[PDB]
Design a protein around this ligand. Structure first.
Ligand SMILES: Nc1ncnc2c1ncn2[C@H]1C[C@H](O)[C@@H](COP(=O)(O)OP(=O)(O)OP(=O)(O)O)O1
Ligand SMILES: [Ca+2]
Ligand SMILES: [Ca+2]
Ligand SMILES: [Cl-]
Ligand SMILES: [Mg+2]
Ligand SMILES: [Mg+2]
Ligand SMILES: [Mn+2]
Length: 747
DNA sequence: ATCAACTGTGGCCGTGGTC
DNA sequence: GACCACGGCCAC
């Protein structure tokens, strides 16, 4: 399989490098014959002799058009000849493209901002991560000597650990007597020993956990202090530290640096994303956390270096086993998008959608539209109407079925051929008309994006079908992440229609999809109440909860399956209503907030404070206890005993102050806030101390006894000290616990 | 490193403002 | 005390 592509320049000329792994052998293929290009549409064919002569400049070297070639293509499905303008070097394209657009005989240019390495993969029809090839993988982690108030990486690395299928080992330059610790003389020898281990094991994948931001930058600083050529790349290069939006990412040429953190962060929802928490979340086994401050007094005193060597070895071991499980996911997503796993695992969703569309456009001989310029961008900032959300019939309900549409919006795009190249296209025999908003969509030929969503949905449903044939629970959970990731990707094609930066943008298409969605779900609700006598308890966009009031579980289930047959035979094309579960009891508080219990006593809760990252644990823990006493047992006297038992204790100061921490993210530069709530008030004070707040910083604070604004008496939970701070028992009772549990206990 | 960043809307609710 | 906008996080 192909791992990655890039290019280098030799004596002015690009050379594509393709990093392959075939038959257990690593190979670099070199391509010097593939040419960079973009396209120009001309007012007339005669003007090509002029456009051919346009020149630019690029660090003193004159940029010319190398050769041109006339090609027939489609733009939004409509045929058109354009001129493919070829250049000697990729960097010619940004140097000359504006001078070509500016030429009065040039109506427009296209595909002029496509990175050459990825251009190569698309035009060659090459897909990374294809084939039976078993990649060799190696995880690594580092233990560092930390002192608070020092510069980054001022202290040494104390241990480097790596793990793979042969096991886990720790390299260190302190005298640790353990069987997996290899002892060397200096920090420099330790790094050099790791470098040699990577060269000897020669892994295809290097796995870290946040190595994009920590491990590699630390290594780089130490190698700079120590005079070490950190030649981890298969071509002898050092790790290449690239900028990616607000943060960094690191590549190792010839291998795949799979940083697990961005992948895990986007597919599992957790309170904290410590390596320990993730490992517990995925496998169910506990992993211990030795702290950067237990580490530092252990190294200076000699004691408990073996416990640190064990925490370092565990870090590498779990990092490996995690990468073992998640690589198939990202290798499949990499195969579907047609780009490298390094890129696909790190990039925004819109960008994946678009790289997928550029490849399909190439395969179909469709010219790509350009990104919007700043004028068009400002024009695309109108919003539109979305899904329908019924106000729930509040309270407790028995024998509830949950019926839900299979991939609704993508199904609508497929069924009604909803796409920019079919919108109000004249001349067709057949049209579907969007309700409320009126846009017409031609049905005579598949639309570009409609013809792509079907293979995605098919892929997802096969994964779900295979989820049904496997007994292994961990393997079933990983299959669950994969099909959910495809669900999100397919739905992002719909959102992409409304995305101001999209090339194939189409706000008519996006509001047509939602309008069809409101039509289908509300027709389904009317159908199930009028023909079958159900009562729709609650509904959100494409599914609903319903019961036959007074009927037992068997009757509600049988009559629910009857309705599905009826409705699914009325529904056209790819629309399909699905049976998504039966619940013995349910409690619906407001829109988006409810909890149900299945016929096994497993509670599923949605939107309620229990699941929110920004409510205090004491509040979440109490509402969880109230809910469980409420839906499992029919014990209203138990729930009320729990809240009163928590009121006292908080008032008596008997509840641990760790359960009162509020976590809220900073999302912008602190100057740009217009409303200063408690998490901003704490963060602005940190900024005044030189703590360097940035978007993404989580404020973890606690509220102390007082009466002013809440931000006035909030401090970082760091600075909490029981000898000196009594917390605000009245705040945590009247503003955190009681509000949460009372909205439930109103019924 | 060469663009990439940031798929869409609906909705609750605590906070700290105005009036 | 009535009301409303901001901001964060969640459900689709
Ligand atoms: N993350 C999202 N981005 C954009 N639109 C979304 C997203 N999540 C949901 N929607 C929209 C499009 C969905 O088809 C519709 C209904 O949501 P939902 O029931 O969760 O998903 P679904 O119908 O695509 O999948 P499933 O087959 O699992 O029910 O709401
Ligand atoms: Ca060469
Ligand atoms: Ca049907
Ligand atoms: Cl760009
Ligand atoms: Mg569903
Ligand atoms: Mg749904
Ligand atoms: Mn659905």
């Amino acid at each position: 399989m192909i791992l990655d592509t890039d290019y280098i320049t030799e004596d002015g000329k690009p050379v594509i490098r393709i990093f392959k792994k075939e038959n257990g052998e690593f190979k670099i293929e070199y391509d010097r014959t593939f040419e960079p290009y973009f396209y120009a549409l001309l007012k007339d064919d005669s003007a090509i002799e002029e456009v051919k002569k346009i020149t630019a400049e690029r660090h003193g070297t004159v940029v010319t058009v190398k050769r041109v070639e006339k090609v027939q293509k489609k733009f939004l499905g409509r045929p058109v000849e354009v001129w493919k303008l070829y250049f000697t070097h990729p960097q010619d394209v940004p140097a000359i493209r504006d001078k070509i657009r500016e030429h009065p005989a040039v109506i427009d240019i296209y595909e002029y901002d496509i990175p050459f390495a990825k251009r190569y993969l698309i035009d060659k029809g090459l897909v990374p991560m294809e084939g039976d090839e078993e990649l060799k993988m190696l995880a690594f982690a580092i233990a560092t000597l930390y002192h608070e108030g020092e510069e980054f990486a001022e202290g040494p690395i104390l241990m480097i650990s790596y793990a793979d299928e042969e096991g886990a080992r720790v390299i260190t330059w302190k005298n640790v007597d353990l069987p997996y610790v290899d002892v060397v003389s200096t920090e420099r020898e330790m790094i050099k020993r790791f470098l040699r281990v990577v060269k000897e094991k020669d892994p295809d994948v290097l796995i870290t956990y946040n190595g994009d931001n920590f491990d590699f930058a630390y290594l780089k600083k130490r190698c700079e202090k120590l005079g070490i050529n950190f030649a981890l790349g298969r071509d002898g290069s050092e790790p290449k530290i690239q900028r990616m939006g607000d943060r960094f990412a690191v590549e190792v040429k010839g291998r795949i640096h799979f940083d697990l953190y961005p992948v895990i962060r986007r597919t599992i929802n957790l309170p904290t994303y410590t390596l320990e928490a993730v490992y517990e979340a995925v496998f169910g086994q506990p992993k211990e956390k030795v702290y950067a401050e237990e580490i530092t007094t252990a190294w200076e005193t000699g004691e408990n270096l073996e416990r640190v060597a064990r925490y370092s070895m565990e870090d590498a071991k779990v990092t490996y086993e995690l990468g073992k499980e998640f690589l198939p996911m990202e290798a499949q997503l990499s195969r579907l998008i047609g780009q490298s796993l390094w890129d696909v695992s790190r990039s925004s969703t819109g960008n994946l959608v678009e790289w997928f569309l550029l490849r399909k456009a190439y395969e179909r001989n469709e010219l790509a539209p350009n990104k919007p310029d700043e004028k068009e961008l400002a024009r695309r900032r109108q919003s539109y109407e979305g899904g329908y959300v019924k106000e729930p019939e509040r309270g407790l309900w028995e024998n509830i079925v949950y019926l839900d549409f299979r991939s609704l919006y993508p199904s609508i795009i497929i069924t009604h051929n909803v796409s920019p190249d079919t919108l109000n296209r004249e001349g067709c025999k057949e049209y579907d008309v969007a309700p409320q908003v009126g846009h017409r969509f031609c049905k005579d030929f598949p639309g570009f994006i409609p013809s792509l969503l079907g293979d995605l949905l098919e892929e997802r449903q096969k994964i779900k079908k295979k989820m049904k044939a496997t007994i292994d629970p961990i393997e079933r959970k990983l299959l669950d992440y994969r099909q959910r990731a495809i669900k999100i990707l397919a739905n992002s094609y719909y959102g992409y229609y409304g995305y101001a930066r999209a090339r194939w943008y189409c706000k008519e298409c996006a509001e047509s999809v939602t309008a069809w969605g409101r039509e289908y779900i509300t027709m389904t609700i009317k159908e199930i109440e009028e023909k079958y006598g159900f009562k729709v308890i609650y509904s959100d966009t494409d599914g609903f909860f319903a019961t036959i009031p007074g009927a037992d579980a068997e009757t509600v289930k049988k009559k629910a399956m009857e309705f599905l047959k009826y409705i699914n035979a009325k529904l056209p094309g790819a629309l399909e209503l699905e049976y998504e579960g039966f619940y013995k009891r349910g409690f619906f508080v407001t829109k988006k907030k409810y909890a149900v219990i299945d016929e096994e006593g497993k509670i599923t809760t949605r939107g309620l404070e229990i699941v929110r990252r920004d409510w205090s644990e004491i509040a979440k823990e109490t509402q969880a206890r109230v809910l469980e006493a409420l839906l499992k047992d029919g014990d209203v006297e138990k729930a009320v005993r729990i809240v009163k038992e928590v009121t006292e204790k908080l008032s008596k100061y008997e509840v641990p102050p760790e359960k009162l921490v509020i976590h809220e993210q900073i999302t912008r530069d602190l100057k740009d806030y217009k409303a200063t709530g408690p998490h901003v008030a704490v963060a602005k004070r940190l900024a005044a101390r030189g703590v360097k707040i940035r978007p993404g910083t989580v404020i973890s604070y606690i509220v102390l006894k007082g009466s002013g604004r809440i931000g006035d008496r909030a401090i970082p939970f760091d600075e909490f000290d029981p000898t000196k701070h009594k917390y605000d028992a009245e705040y945590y009772i009247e503003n955190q616990v009681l509000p949460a549990v009372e909205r439930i206990l109103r019924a």
